[PDB]
Amino acid sequence: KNFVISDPRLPDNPIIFASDSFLELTEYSREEILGRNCRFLQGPETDQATVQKIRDAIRDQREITVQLINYTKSGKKFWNLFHLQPMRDQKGELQYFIGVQLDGEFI
Numbered sequence: 001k002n003f004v005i006s007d008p009r010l011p012d013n014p015i016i017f018a019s020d021s022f023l024e025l026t027e028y029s030r031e032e033i034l035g036r037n038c039r040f041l042q043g044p045e046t047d048q049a050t051v052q053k054i055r056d057a058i059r060d061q062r063e064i065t066v067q068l069i070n071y072t073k074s075g076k077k078f079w080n081l082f083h084l085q086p087m088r089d090q091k092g093e094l095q096y097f098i099g100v101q102l103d104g105e106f107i
Contacts, residue, residue, distance in 0.1 A: 002101040004038065008058070008094060012037045016096075021103055027073040038099065041070035045077060054084065061086045061094055067106060079106035 002025065005017040014035045023030060026041060042051065050068045057064035063085045070080040081102040089095045 002103040004033075004099045004101075006038065006097045006099070008097060013058070013097070022101060025072075025078075025101070025103070026070070027076075032073075041080070043069070043071040043077075045069045057084060058097065081106050 001019060002021040003019050004015050004022055006013045007016050010016075015033055015038055016035075018030060018033050023033070026033075039051075046069050050066055053064065054066060063083065065081070065083045067079055067081045069077055071077055083100045085098050085100070086094055087096040087098055
């Protein structure tokens with residue numbers, strides 16, 4: 001499946017794991033993704049109203065589903081439908097965010 005994990009307990013919430021199909025879809029290698037915030041997939045056509053909603057969901061630690069324009073390494077635009085989900089530990093404390101993508105371009 002197609003997903004990434006970020007660690008919000010590290011500066012600027014970096015990606016610490018990416019599945020192989022996410023690498024294939026974005027055309028990036030694992031070593032140029034790990035340790036970065038996911039926002040590098042954004043570009044000029046990305047809807048800022050939608051980015052705001054993600055920012056608010058991360059702040060409130062709520063699950064959200066969104067669609068937005070992202071860019072592969074070679075600069076190809078694609079519609080990315082991904083669902084964001086908080087992952088808490090046993091004490092109810094936030095540990096990770098997981099982002100699960102539809103394994104292909106969209107409408």
